[PDB]
Design an enzyme around this catalytic site. Structure first.
Site, PDB file in Angstrom:
ATOM      1  N   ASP A  77       0.787  -1.248   0.000  1.00 33.47           N
ATOM      2  CA  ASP A  77       0.000   0.000   0.000  1.00 33.47           C
ATOM      3  C   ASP A  77       0.818   1.296   0.000  1.00 33.47           C
ATOM      4  O   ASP A  77       0.242   2.386   0.098  1.00 33.47           O
ATOM      5  CB  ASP A  77      -0.994   0.033   1.168  1.00 33.47           C
ATOM      6  N   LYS A 126       3.352   1.773  -4.885  1.00 42.75           N
ATOM      7  CA  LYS A 126       4.134   1.285  -6.020  1.00 42.75           C
ATOM      8  C   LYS A 126       3.393   1.364  -7.358  1.00 42.75           C
ATOM      9  O   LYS A 126       3.929   1.850  -8.368  1.00 42.75           O
ATOM     10  CB  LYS A 126       4.582  -0.164  -5.755  1.00 42.75           C
ATOM     11  N   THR A 127       2.158   0.885  -7.378  1.00 39.36           N
ATOM     12  CA  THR A 127       1.405   0.832  -8.634  1.00 39.36           C
ATOM     13  C   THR A 127       0.969   2.220  -9.089  1.00 39.36           C
ATOM     14  O   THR A 127       0.977   2.527 -10.288  1.00 39.36           O
ATOM     15  CB  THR A 127       0.183  -0.079  -8.489  1.00 39.36           C
ATOM     16  N   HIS A 169       2.352  -7.053  -0.661  1.00 42.42           N
ATOM     17  CA  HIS A 169       1.709  -7.882   0.350  1.00 42.42           C
ATOM     18  C   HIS A 169       2.651  -9.009   0.760  1.00 42.42           C
ATOM     19  O   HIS A 169       3.348  -9.593  -0.084  1.00 42.42           O
ATOM     20  CB  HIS A 169       0.388  -8.454  -0.170  1.00 42.42           C
TER      21      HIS A 169
END
Ligand SMILES: Nc1nc2c(ncn2[C@@H]2O[C@H](COP(=O)(O)OP(=O)(O)NP(=O)(O)O)[C@@H](O)[C@H]2O)c(=O)[nH]1
Ligand SMILES: O=C(O)c1ccc(Br)o1
Ligand SMILES: [Mg+2]
Ligand SMILES: [N+]
Length: 404
Positions: free
Chosen positions: A20, A23-24, A84
């Site tokens: 969270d 990164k994306t 994760h």
């Protein structure tokens, strides 16, 4: 999108960091920001990256995604990894492709357990340089907290032999940059505060992450990172070419994980859905393989010039076993300990066999022992690896001697 034209050097980068931390969102922002200055860049929105039904269901990155962008200086393939804790295996395969990693750390949270774990693992699959992006600064008013976060991250990198005091640490907001690019996709450098922070990151990537020395003359070798079926084409194996070259028509051998090697003909080579006349060391490619299904080639095998690689099952290793303070084991282990070993994109169960007289290995120990893998894999002396068991990283090693 047609043929791939080599106009500039190519480098593989990517995003790592705790779940969270952004990164994306940052990966998407990079594509949008670079696309304004270079029309060869196709923009990728957040949902184009976290696109899989299971990623939508669970609300996290699960699969690595590859995106393309470029600056004036270089062409980049960028591997965005999951943060994760349960998808570390996928992150490892991603980092195994990177010539440099962008470590994303939330300014609001500071370094967290997968900040540490990703740094450690990036090292064990050969990531040579790290740039830091401190994200979500839009959420943090206090300059003191930001300085603390940077200090902690730099010190964390030092613990894993990165030059923590030297790495660029870029402070910004991936989300606010991405928002600005949605409102004006033509937003150029110097026009917007958040977009310019992404340019600071691109500059740091350009200048701090060197183009690796690669060898295109040695036998072709490509660790397989993923495999899928293209409707109406066949089976594609993806990966970063480690060395040598591959052309359509070349025979290659699929090496590792099976009792025996098998040979196939390459019938397609692409980088970012663009046709390659020749794949060369460093390229991030998809290789179409004739006469094999997606059940006959898999992640962790390697594609190689026929006869150039003999896979192995047994080796000696020098291993550091993590202390519990590093997220490692609380207790020690004995001969017969049976964890997972990670070499580049390969993950395989192996059996630990300690010397006569060495009954037990404890967390914190630097030790040498013998590993017997349950399947053959492409191995070599000096290759670093990670050891994991029960969903946690327990060790870091390097192959010292190949026994079989
Ligand atoms: N305020 C703020 N929120 C941000 C920023 N960047 C990302 N976020 C938020 O942080 C959340 C996680 O973003 P995401 O890009 O998915 O992070 P991730 O590191 O890729 N997650 P994962 O580890 O699952 O792959 C989202 O709700 C996103 O909107 C930022 O710069 N500022
Ligand atoms: O769609 C892909 O990724 C692809 C198709 C053919 C090759 Br080679 O890669
Ligand atoms: Mg993500
Ligand atoms: N993804």
């Amino acid at each position: 999108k047609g043929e791939f034209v080599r106009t500039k050097p190519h480098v593989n980068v990517g995003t790592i960091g705790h779940v969270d931390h952004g990164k994306t969102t940052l990966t998407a922002a990079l594509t949008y920001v670079a696309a304004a200055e270079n029309p060869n860049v196709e923009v990728k929105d957040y949902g184009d990256i976290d696109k899989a039904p299971e990623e939508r269901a669970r609300g996290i990155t699960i699969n690595t995604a590859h995106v393309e962008y470029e600056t004036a200086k270089r062409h980049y393939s960028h591997v965005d990894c999951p943060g994760h804790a349960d998808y570390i295996k996928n992150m490892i395969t991603g980092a195994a492709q990177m010539d440099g990693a962008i470590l994303v750390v939330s300014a609001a949270d500071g370094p967290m357990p997968q900040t540490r774990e990703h740094i450690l693992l990036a090292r064990q699959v050969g990531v040579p340089y790290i740039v830091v992006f401190m994200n979500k600064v839009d959420m943090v008013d206090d300059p003191e907290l930001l300085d603390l976060v940077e200090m902690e991250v730099r010190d964390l990198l030092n613990q894993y032999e990165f030059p923590g005091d030297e790495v660029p640490v870029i402070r910004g907001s991936a989300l606010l940059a991405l928002e600005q690019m949605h409102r004006n996709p033509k937003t150029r450098r110097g026009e917007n505060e958040w977009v310019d922070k992404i340019w600071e990151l691109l500059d740091a990537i350009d200048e701090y992450i060197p183009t690796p020395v690669r060898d295109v003359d040695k036998p072709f070798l490509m660790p397989v990172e993923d495999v899928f079926t293209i409707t109406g084409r066949g089976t594609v194996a993806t990966g970063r070419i480690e060395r040598g070259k591959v052309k359509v028509g070349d025979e290659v051998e699929i090496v590792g994980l099976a009792p025996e090697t098998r040979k196939t003909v390459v019938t397609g080579v692409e980088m970012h859905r663009k046709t390659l006349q020749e794949g060369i060391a460093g390229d991030n490619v998809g290789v179409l393989l004739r006469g094999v299904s997606r059940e006959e080639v898999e992640r962790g095998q390697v594609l190689a010039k026929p006869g150039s690689i003999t896979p192995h099952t047994k080796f000696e290793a020098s291993v550091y076993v993590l202390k519990k303070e590093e997220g490692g084991r609380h207790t020690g282990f004995f001969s017969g300990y049976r964890p997972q070993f990670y070499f580049r994109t390969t993950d395989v169960t192996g059996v630990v066999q300690l010397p006569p007289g060495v009954e037990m290995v404890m967390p914190g120990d630097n030790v040498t022992f013998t590993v017997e893998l349950i399947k053959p894999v492409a191995l070599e002396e000096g290759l670093r690896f990670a050891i994991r068991e029960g969903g946690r990283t327990v060790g870091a090693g390097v192959v010292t001697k190949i026994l079989e």
